[PDB]
Amino acid sequence: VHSYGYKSGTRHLFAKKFRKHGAPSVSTILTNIKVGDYVDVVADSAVREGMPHKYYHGRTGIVWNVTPRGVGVIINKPVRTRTLRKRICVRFEHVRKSRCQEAFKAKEHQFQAYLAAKKAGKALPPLKKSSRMGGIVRPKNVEVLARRVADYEAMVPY
Template identity: 55%
Template sequence: MGGKSKGKRSGTRYKFSQGFRKHGECTANKYLEKINYGDYVDIVCDSSQQKGMPFNFYHGRTGKVFHITKRGVGVLVNKRVRHRIIQKKVCVRIEHVRKSRCNEDFILRKKKNQEIIKEAKLKNEHVSVKRKTEGPKPAAMIKVPPSKLITVEPLPFYEEY
């Protein structure tokens, strides 16, 4: 009576399975995607390619590219171990990586801010590009017929002992 094996891919029956009509090798677009140092990438294991597959903990994690080789990338991923967060270095093949959209809105905001600053410089104005919190909604009057008005009062207190 041995027990259950605890191999590298144990418990990944559904995690690594491909979607309906998504089986087979990955397309050429995956290899042509340009990845640079410092880019955020999502680690998504492709079970059709066993080489360079990360451990199943890293499936679905987002990290930063710190190293690029011919066939793979090195990704820095944060991992919580008990009370601390450790930066783990994971070497992953290109097939198991896709560009992340986690900072897409930040990049757009950065570009808009640069345009705003450029226009302000032409007009010799000082402009603040800091984000401002949305204030409270403006006051509004609600029209209710007097017959539908109800006075809300708390229930009277009764001692029960």
């Protein structure tokens, strides 16, 4: 980076992948964003206006303001001794709802559905056990490890 411009470092970060070129698909226009929701900021390059800065590409935060064509996101940018909490304004083409929170909110459902399942039983599925615990092994086939005379002429090709 010689010139320290606005979008000074990027012929790759902002390039579209090979044979993925195109303008943004419908499915990302028909997503809707509620305030408080987590989001990935990934800048699409086929929409000029509204891009996030080079730093924010690839981060996640909590949407806060929602405007007709815009959004806004709260992202943690570490600075000298501290993390400022930055508010950026993006055109939502660059925004995708994050799956980050997901496996947790699925752990919470599979607890409650578990709990209402014990309430009056029906019992419950069995608890899987460790693979690291003991056992006798009954080998179906057994072979020998050795270094072969032939193994060396394979490592000098040609």
